[PDB]
Amino acid sequence: PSLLLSKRIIFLSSPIYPHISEQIISQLLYLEYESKRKPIHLYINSTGDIDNNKIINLNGITDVISIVDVINYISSDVYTYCLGKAYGIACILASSGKKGYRFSLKNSSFCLNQNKEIMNTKKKVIEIISKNTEKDTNVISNVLERDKYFNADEAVDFKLIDHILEK
Amino acid sequence: PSLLLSKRIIFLSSPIYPHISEQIISQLLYLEYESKRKPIHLYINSTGDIDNNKIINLNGITDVISIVDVINYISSDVYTYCLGKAYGIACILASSGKKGYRFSLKNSSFCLNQSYSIIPFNQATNIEIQNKEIMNTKKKVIEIISKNTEKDTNVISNVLERDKYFNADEAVDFKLIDHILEK
Amino acid sequence: PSLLLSKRIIFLSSPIYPHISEQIISQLLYLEYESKRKPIHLYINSTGDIDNNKIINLNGITDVISIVDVINYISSDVYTYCLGKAYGIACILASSGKKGYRFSLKNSSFCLNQSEIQNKEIMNTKKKVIEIISKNTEKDTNVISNVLERDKYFNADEAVDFKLIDHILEK
Amino acid sequence: PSLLLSKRIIFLSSPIYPHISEQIISQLLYLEYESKRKPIHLYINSTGDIDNNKIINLNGITDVISIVDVINYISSDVYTYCLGKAYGIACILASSGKKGYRFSLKNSSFCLNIMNTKKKVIEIISKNTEKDTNVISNVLERDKYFNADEAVDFKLIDHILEK
Amino acid sequence: PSLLLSKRIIFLSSPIYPHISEQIISQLLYLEYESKRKPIHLYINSTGDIDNNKIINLNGITDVISIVDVINYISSDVYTYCLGKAYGIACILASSGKKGYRFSLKNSSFCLNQSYSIIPFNQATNIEIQNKEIMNTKKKVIEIISKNTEKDTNVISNVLERDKYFNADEAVDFKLIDHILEK
Amino acid sequence: PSLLLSKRIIFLSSPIYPHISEQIISQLLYLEYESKRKPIHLYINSTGDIDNNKIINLNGITDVISIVDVINYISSDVYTYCLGKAYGIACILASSGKKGYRFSLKNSSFCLNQEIMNTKKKVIEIISKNTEKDTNVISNVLERDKYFNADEAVDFKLIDHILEK
Amino acid sequence: PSLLLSKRIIFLSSPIYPHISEQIISQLLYLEYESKRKPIHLYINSTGDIDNNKIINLNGITDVISIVDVINYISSDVYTYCLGKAYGIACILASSGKKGYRFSLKNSSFCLNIEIQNKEIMNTKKKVIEIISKNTEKDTNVISNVLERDKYFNADEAVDFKLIDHILEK
């Protein structure tokens, strides 16, 4: 709760509900104001915007776009640690941590899932994943037409994640 | 909450419901009383007075007119930061920050709605008073946007006959916003 | 909330529901007991006893009479600040602040509404509302009685001229 | 709630519901145990046991009796202040404050409305107003409304607040 | 609430519901543990186990026997104070305070109800067991009232055959209450 | 609640529903970790797993067994106090308190009821250990419902003292 | 609740529902940051991922694998205590506690139970054997063989099998 904040830790351990992305942003903002260039630890154990076959956030993809935008804006490096699951927008979130400081446990799981606004958002999500994984917007666009699950090792190979944690 | 308040941050992160506009004004007054000429950081990620095609605030326009009025009275400069969306009355609010200190993130969107008035279900007893108020409100919102963007009321009145969407760059060009935030 | 209370600020930011006038009196009493002759800042953005034209307080007029009565009783001065709207009973309230210290924002609006057993009380209530507005505006009971025969809408400038309000706040 | 209590204030600002008379007694008790002979300030703005023709307390009369009996019991004086309205049982309560210390605002209003209950209510008012049980009983058969000044002459109220 | 508890006060201000007798005991135990031999003030304004006219606690009598038992158990004296009504089991409760310290207000009322027992019939309602329990409860209630009033079990048994109402003065003579009120 | 917990008191004042045994163990463990060798006061007023003829807990017997197993693990002694009723599994719980420190009020009532074979052996065994009797003699009495008043429970060695004054 | 947390105690007292494995990880992380190298007490009374013959967590196995991962991650030792039942994935959990500090009460019980299936299930089964093998200091073959049959252990049999280290007593 506040004890984790005093140590610059944010734990996402639920589906990203509308109030959750608000809380992540609020906490990121607070921490940046507390100390300018001091690492922030974002622990992730989430199924993203979905929860038992139901989308629990009508604005999930745009919410995560906002979070990664503030992550890019603030001077504090945010490290990511996957503690079990990082699916959908949570996987995007995980891969958005500072390059070289995106971590995962050995057995964690990862997954990637008027009219004009829908397409602009789709281009924005592709650009982030492409930038994070160091791959062309062409090759990432193609993989997102199906659902792909990575294990921790497969996530390191794909450059979603950098290192696997050990004690 | 109060933790954001301790840093002089007001974070609008929802549609501007009746109670939200009350909270913004309350926090503005509170911060101004706590410290006199000290910048206030208004972060905005809002769809204004609409939420899923439904109007969630019948008094949205006057509420935001009220907010920008208190922003203009208090000695503390308020900087605005768009964190994703600033639509309708939230766009007016964003552009109302101190000139030079209206910021936006890379992927943020802004929208100005085609000029509109909402008549609540309940009949106003004085129709003549209500009609004059609808006109003054329509006049004030054009006046605020015209001032914020440094444009004539003719061009702003003209552009409020259609819905207009802005990316950050287009918002900087239209003078709704000053700078796009980077590392 | 209690955060505003610590700065001796009362913020009326809604139609005056029954519980609202109760809170205003409660807070005025509390602040008076907390510090004796220290100013109280009453900020007002209210459409009075109607909420979007729907009547939400049957005792609106008698409520505000009590509030202005406690304001006149307590030793602490109350300054009033109109943040957008002050309609009907909210207008009476705004004008009841200490003379010289009744403020309003540039775009604020004001409105004075049209006017044995209960029958005697109704005429008494009308006499009091005239008497308060007469005293607040420095006008005779006859000229105020005549003006309340119809609705009168005010902008900030028109409110200053009528002496409902003293100053328009500017940075 | 607790903020007014810390200043030894009890503020009856609604019709006297069943839970209200309980809260008034609870606070009266707490305050007496908190400080022995320190005055208590009972502020009243109430229409009694009636709220728009609907009687909101079947025990309204017996409840206020318990409160006044609690008032006469405790060592702390209670000062009453009418802040707008005090009708029916709320008028009885207001008049039950320590004699000399029953106050009212300028524009305040007052009103007065098996067999054992009827005698007790007539008796308390008679004691409060310093009048015969006969003259009070005779005038209680008609609903009578007092303004602040009229309340002082009848001795329901001692002073009208100013300054 | 916790405010009255800080002053060693328990205020029974309602019918004795099933959960209420649990709350009385918990507060008795808590206060006893807070200070060992320091008086507890039980204020009573209760109509017992009935509320115009429904029985609101099917186990009312056994509940009050529990309360008086813990009252007899704890080292702390409990003084009783009747603040209006103490009917039925609340009258037994009121009379159970330490002798010399059972108090009442001037206009207070007391009542002891006439009695009968209505026993439901299910699939496993043993007549030998339930009738014997009804017998012990009746013996305990008379025994408690007998001790409290310092009267014979015979005269107390006889008085419970009819309804008896008391004012404050009548209760002191009957040894339910010790003292009236004072300035 | 936490108010009773602050004084090392656990007050069971209801039937032992599925959720109750989970709560008692939680409070026992908390108090043990709060202070190591400090008596816990278990006040009991319960009809066991039966509320008005109807069974309110299918795992009543196994649930109460887990509680006593915890009582025989933690270093803090638990004193039991019967506040009116300790029927069936509640009687087992009451008798499971520290020897010499099982109390009852004057007017209290106790009762004993008339994988499956393995559990029934433990229930006979625990009572035998609690009452200092052979599993043989206790097995004999559990063929019928036996109700105790306070005095009879003391003689039977379910309870140690009757608290008074 | 947080009252047990203040004493560094996590009390698993139900089937491991999806939110339960979620709460355990939350609590382990919290305790680790609250005090860095200070023992955590994981009390277990659980039927694992089954309740009344119904599966209550489809990801029960991967969840407990992830929990053992956080246990292996944090600097704080976690002591385990079986308070009655530790079946299936709950048994894996109990045996995953610090060696020498896996405890049980006397009367406690223990039990070990195309495109989508081909690589997901067979990988999971290999991990489950590998963990139990490490915990019990036994080869993967004897564990793979013992897992083909439903096997129950009492406290004594659990100690001999090296699932549990000590049987605690007052």
Coordinates of C-alpha atoms in Angstrom, one line a residue, chain B residues 61-62 65 92 114-118 130-146 153 156-157 160:
Chain B
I61 CA -20.1 24.0 -19.4
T62 CA -20.8 26.4 -16.5
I65 CA -16.5 28.2 -16.8
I92 CA -11.4 24.1 -22.5
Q114 CA -20.0 21.4 -31.8
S115 CA -21.6 24.1 -29.7
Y116 CA -24.4 22.6 -27.7
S117 CA -26.9 23.5 -24.9
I118 CA -28.6 21.0 -22.5
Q130 CA -33.3 30.7 -19.2
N131 CA -33.0 31.8 -22.9
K132 CA -30.8 34.7 -22.0
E133 CA -28.6 32.5 -19.9
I134 CA -28.2 29.9 -22.7
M135 CA -27.0 32.7 -24.9
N136 CA -24.5 34.2 -22.3
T137 CA -23.1 30.7 -21.7
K138 CA -22.7 30.2 -25.5
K139 CA -20.9 33.6 -25.6
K140 CA -18.6 32.9 -22.6
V141 CA -17.3 29.5 -23.9
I142 CA -16.5 31.1 -27.3
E143 CA -14.8 34.0 -25.4
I144 CA -12.6 31.7 -23.3
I145 CA -11.5 29.5 -26.3
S146 CA -10.9 32.6 -28.4
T153 CA -14.4 35.0 -32.0
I156 CA -13.8 30.1 -33.1
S157 CA -17.6 30.5 -33.6
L160 CA -17.6 25.3 -33.2

